[PDB]
Design a protein around this ligand. Structure first.
Ligand SMILES: OCCCc1ccc(OCc2ccccc2)cc1
Ligand SMILES: OCCCc1ccc(OCc2ccccc2)cc1
Ligand SMILES: [Mg+2]
Ligand SMILES: [Mg+2]
Lengths: 546, 546
């Protein structure tokens, strides 16, 4: 029956309600009870407030009108207002006090996920204050989670006038009886009820959600902790930079603030960062999530040397140049992890801060050919398998779905060990034709990967592994240096290739290195423990890169 | 004969030289003459400084080594160093003191323009100081102007070792005798001379440029003031955002800092901002230069209503949403100018600041149908010509080169008056088949436009003019408001359509409005007076939007 849910902003999706600062100010200031609410509401349908809510006047124009009203109200109540009583001040303070009521957003989210059309319907104002950015940020963070945002000041109508509920119904393409509407103001619910909408008078959130749960029959309270927001690829800004004639790099870009460049591993995608992109933007960073050379919509030349670390690094520097970025924070995972340590070592002036998930920094061994170093560790045997051009391409390209479904697995689901891969004749020789879907990924998400790898396949990606010697010789130039810019190493308890202990000597080369550690997290860190990853990166960003 | 010019950074392209802070510090501090330079140079080929310059160690590792050296040098000179004498401090201060020597850059620029291969060859260091961003910014600003940047610490060689001059020659693909090499250090010139390169020992800039002028036979001194840096389209980062299903917007993006969204007029392009894009990035802004809906690589749906101001505005808001920008500064010209005033009036929370070149803000007249208002001004007659779908498309699409060559003209070159265009039967009825090239534009630049307009032609662009009534009705909703966010109006003395006096009542609607005015500047402001435009926008940005 119910197909749509409509939430108000003030006092429903955001708390404390600014209407409510009127009440608290009176108390705080020992003013006559209601005085401020009377001034706010003076003249009713024809007063300052309604013109403001209709978008006739802006907030800054309304401020001195509400001032006049407070003066008139106190005159008729035979009282005085404080010295330096300031509506601008009261409203500035109230508006930045109000935060998203997280459990109400999550209930809206959940309803949207079960197929509800969701909408914000709100009486609000054209805000032109010096401090208006605060509210613009709130609205941005909320509006992305709903099908419609309807603002009194944009449609020229206000709750409780009946026409706005008709506008609402009409926007929803729903009949009244398919809609639940929640509001903290009874008068505003009334015309919804008159049409036969289900209504919830929201006092405390939990009670309102209990009613919402009863009436929709969906669990909203006590639900398990939900994944962070993910990215829909076709809602991203897609960026392209030519860094030299045959080579152009694609990235996805979200947010403003210090630039943070995300570098994925093998065989992945900008999309591997889908859980960190909104969270880091939301946290005040300009996120650039690359397709690394070899992948997705970035170029993928065939030649092996196109993928030695040196070339890859110079290219990332050039990418900063063409974007006009003197620095970025570099954050890498797997191969991307190795690359950012090298960016720190060879281009510190371009790296605001460096962090790696799983990939430790290991210096080159000048006394040992790198193939041999690789042979000394049974778990890098997969890297030897990747040497012979063609062999790994053929296995990985043969059935793309099966490739990513076999690779992308949590630590308790795994079907392939990186163990004696050459001997066995391949990575998938002992895994199923049709692996089950990991808890970490939807079918839709696997198919995104599949589609990305249809463009260039695995030649470029694999070439990353085919410059051991070249990288060795380049890295040897860096053996007297240390990494002295801000640096974070995040180890993954259950990555059985990039084990935590592999990172244990890193303080020798990076004496002020900071750490995080994620338990019960396999190799695919970002999608395995998105929540912990986000928290560890934002904490480290805010304190070391900001 | 000479085909290449090579400049050093310290003391040639940038001043004061940091080598020179050693000398001044000794003086300032009454230390033994040369003490600091001895410590700097201690151990020669095997000392700390040479390892630093070779990229063996980073700056932060070198700092305490040079400290030890100063201590040893003063011990053997039987003197003491000051309390709180700090190499970190001395170097921090020296490195931020050094600026681009503008006349040397401009001489390099000019030589590049006459076909020289230009290069920076420098002894420099891997800089990992907290304050390294300062130098990264300098290098970025310089390196874009040269074919090659060769850094001692990247190639593992230093002046004066002979191998680096061979590396140089080899990078230039030149023989020694085709190269002029300028340096402030004689010992560094010597091996260039040994190979038979022309060398200039740079003490003061002007003398060095006189020698450079004699020897190359090109005028470098006393040259007229040059245009600002322009953009090469295929070196830009190109951005794409889908704002709704059939509509995607393209922009070019350069720089970091507050977001500044540039909105071109009819019939133009992101490329119309080519002179402001580097200057505003350089000035500390994140520039987004749009193709507006209808143009270039943005979508161009056919329907007229796709281009009413309301839709265009909502779309620019959506563009901010998908980029995760809560605000931007909006700067517009012509139609883009009109659009940004409307962004200010209907989305102030999304507009950090608003500025328009040429286009004044005029409120809707609620007592007069807009066609009639347009008819009251002989110079808007061209707007009536644009009403009838097809008519203006056919004339403007007929010969693209001729279209832009006839439109893009300075105030003293013009071939078309906007005067009785309907009556005459068209915009170009009395202009040549092959107009001469305006001083404002190269043939190459015209052809960029031509190529952009081959994608969609003039239907979408023209539709901007075909919603007079619709815009009127929408604008009437805004008649009680004022623009109270920061705002700049720039008038163009010789724009005979958007005349300066058309803007004279704007203070009534925008009481804190700021102004700039450009003399002897026609309708195509950005390319007509790029230098004055840049200066007026940066001054206004830095004080009102920052
Ligand atoms: O799956 C790629 C993980 C990132 C990664 C990439 C390369 C690597 O080098 C092994 C090595 C060890 C010693 C010498 C040379 C190479 C270690 C991790
Ligand atoms: O060439 C386009 C210049 C920008 C511009 C665009 C429209 C405009 O409206 C004239 C008008 C005047 C009065 C009512 C309606 C329209 C004025 C300038
Ligand atoms: Mg409310
Ligand atoms: Mg020098």
């Amino acid at each position: 029956t119910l197909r749509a849910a409509v939430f108000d902003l003030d006092g429903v999706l955001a708390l404390p309600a600014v209407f409510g600062v009127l009440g608290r100010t009176e108390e705080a200031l020992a003013l006559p009870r209601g005085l401020l609410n009377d001034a706010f509401q003076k003249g009713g349908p024809e007063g300052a407030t309604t013109r403001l809510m209709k978008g006739e006047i802006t907030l800054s124009q309304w401020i001195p009108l509400m001032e006049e009203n407070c003066r008139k109200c106190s005159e008729t109540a035979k009282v005085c207002l404080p010295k330096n009583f300031s509506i601008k001040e009261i409203f500035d303070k109230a508006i930045s006090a109000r935060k998203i009521n997280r459990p109400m957003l999550q209930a809206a989210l959940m309803l949207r996920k079960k197929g509800f059309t969701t909408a914000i319907l709100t009486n609000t104002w054209l805000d032109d204050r010096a401090e208006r950015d605060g509210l613009a940020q709130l609205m941005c963070e909320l509006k992305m989670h709903f099908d419609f945002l309807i603002e009194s000041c944009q449609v020229g109508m206000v709750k409780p006038e009946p026409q706005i509920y008709k506008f609402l119904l009409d926007t929803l393409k729903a009949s009244p009886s398919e809609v639940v509407f929640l509001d903290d103001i009874g008068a505003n619910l009334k015309p919804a009820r008159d049409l036969g909408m289900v209504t919830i008078l929201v006092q405390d959130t939990d009670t309102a959600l209990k009613e919402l749960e009863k009436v929709t029959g969906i669990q909203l309270l006590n639900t398990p902790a939900p994944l962070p927001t993910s990215c829909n690829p076709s809602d991203m800004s897609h960026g392209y930079v030519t860094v030299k004639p045959r080579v152009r790099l694609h990235f996805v870009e979200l947010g403003s603030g210090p630039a943070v460049c995300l570098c994925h591993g093998f065989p992945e995608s900008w999309y591997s960062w889908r859980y960190q992109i909104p969270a880091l933007a939301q946290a005040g960073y300009r996120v650039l999530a690359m397709d690394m050379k070899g992948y997705g919509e970035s170029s993928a030349p065939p030649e092996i040397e196109e993928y030695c670390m040196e070339v890859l690094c110079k290219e990332m520097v050039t990418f900063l140049d063409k974007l006009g970025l003197s620095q970025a924070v570099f954050i890498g995972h797997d191969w991307g992890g190795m690359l950012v340590w090298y960016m720190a070592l060879f281009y510190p002036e371009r790296v605001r801060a460096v962090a790696s998930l799983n990939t430790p920094f290991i210096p080159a061994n000048p006394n040992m050919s790198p193939l041999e170093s690789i042979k000394a560790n049974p778990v890098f045997d997969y890297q030897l398998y990747f040497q012979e051009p063609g062999v790994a391409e053929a296995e990985l390209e043969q059935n793309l779905s099966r490739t990513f479904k076999s690779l992308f697995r949590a630590s308790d689901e795994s079907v392939l060990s990186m163990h004696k891969v050459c001997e066995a004749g391949g990575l998938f020789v002992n895994s199923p034709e049709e692996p089950s879907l990991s808890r970490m990924v939807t079918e839709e998400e696997i198919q995104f990967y599949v589609q990305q790898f249809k463009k260039s396949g695995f030649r470029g990606p694999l070439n990353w592994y085919r410059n051991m010697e070249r990288n060795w010789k380049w890295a040897c130039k860096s053996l007297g240096r240390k990494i002295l810019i801000p640096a974070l190493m995040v180890t993954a308890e259950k990555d059985f290739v990039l084990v935590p202990q592999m990172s244990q000597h890193m303080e020798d080369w990076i004496p002020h290195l900071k750490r995080g550690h994620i338990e019960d997290c396999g190799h695919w860190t970002q999608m395995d423990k998105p929540t912990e990853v986000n928290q560890i990166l934002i904490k480290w960003l805010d304190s070391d890169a900001r």
